[PDB]
Amino acid sequence: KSPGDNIDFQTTILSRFDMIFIVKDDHNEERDISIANHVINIHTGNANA
């Protein structure tokens, strides 16, 4: 769909806002294992901390 037109019927919101970041999650086993392993690290053994 058009990038705007998302919020209610009006893009004006997005006009007021300076920096709009659309975030995307696509599944890439390399990257997905990266993020996952990172979280496993996050919980404990606190190795990340």
């Binding site: 990038p3 300076d18 920096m19 709009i20 970041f21 659309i22």
Partner: peptide
């Protein structure tokens, strides 16, 4: 800054 905001424009495009 120009290029950072350019990434924002790329976000405006999609």
């Amino acid at each position: 800054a120009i290029r950072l905001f350019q990434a924002s424009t790329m976000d405006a495009a999609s």
